């Protein structure tokens, strides 16, 4: 029940405390790039991030109220969206670059090291620039990331009771976003406009995840480098439905 009794500020403090750490890549600037090496770095990084993401999700208010089966489903649905929003967030203050890790800062030209990747990189850079122009706050970011986790798979799941609870927690997160904006002195018209602007960005993050996933579960991208069992299973949750 915890999620529904939290005040706005308590939701924010809970979400901030639950934030995963920023991991390092194995990037060696003395080992020039290559489709293989870039893929290796990104997969190795994502793989380690997934473990922290799983433990983060457990701390998102309302998430542990769900059945294990439903938790699995939400994470399978949202994992790449969640990695991506994290990436665009830490990349904000690096115009023209994606900060994959503190020791891995890439621009679009290096996105060309893997066929089909530059298009996605450009989308990620645009999203990061959008967050930068809006001066996205850390408190807002953690709300948005939790919304992705709860929302992305909610329509692809007694069983109805689980959806309803999810909806109530999502409403509380909306309340929380608005509370943060009001606290920041925004007028009511400004609050609604900003709330909408942020939520529309989620549609773009969905788009990016779907386009990326489509490349990632292609036989070509899966045989560039040996993939970990956990990533293979996360990817397969999506490949299962592909043509």
């Amino acid at each position: 029940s915890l999620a529904l009794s939290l005040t706005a500020d308590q939701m924010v403090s809970a979400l901030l405390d639950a934030e995963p750490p920023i991991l390092y890549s194995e990037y060696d600037p003395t080992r020039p790039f290559s489709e293989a090496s870039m893929m290796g770095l990104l997969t190795n990084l994502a793989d380690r991030e997934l473990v922290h993401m799983i433990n983060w999700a457990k701390r998102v208010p309302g998430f542990v109220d769900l059945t294990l089966h439903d938790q699995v489903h939400l994470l399978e649905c949202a994992w790449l969206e969640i990695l991506m929003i994290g990436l665009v967030w830490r990349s904000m203050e690096h115009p023209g670059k994606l900060l994959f890790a503190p020791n891995l800062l890439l621009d679009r030209n290096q996105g060309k090291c893997v066929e089909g990747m530059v298009e996605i990189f450009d989308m990620l850079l645009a999203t990061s620039s959008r967050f930068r122009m809006m001066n996205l706050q850390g408190e807002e970011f953690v709300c948005l990331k939790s919304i992705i986790l709860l929302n992305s798979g909610v329509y692809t799941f007694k069983s109805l009771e689980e959806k309803d609870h999810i909806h109530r927690v999502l409403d509380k997160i909306t309340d929380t976003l608005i509370h943060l904006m009001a606290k920041a002195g925004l007028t009511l018209q400004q609050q609604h406009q900003r709330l909408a602007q942020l939520l529309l960005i989620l549609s773009h993050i969905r788009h990016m995840s779907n386009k990326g996933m489509e490349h990632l579960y292609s036989m070509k991208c899966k045989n560039v480098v040996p993939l970990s069992d956990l990533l293979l299973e996360m990817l397969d949750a999506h490949r299962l439905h592909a043509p």
Partner: peptide, 9 residues
Amino acid sequence: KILHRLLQD
């Protein structure tokens, strides 16, 4: 599933 396992922990 590994995800299932890690969540259950």
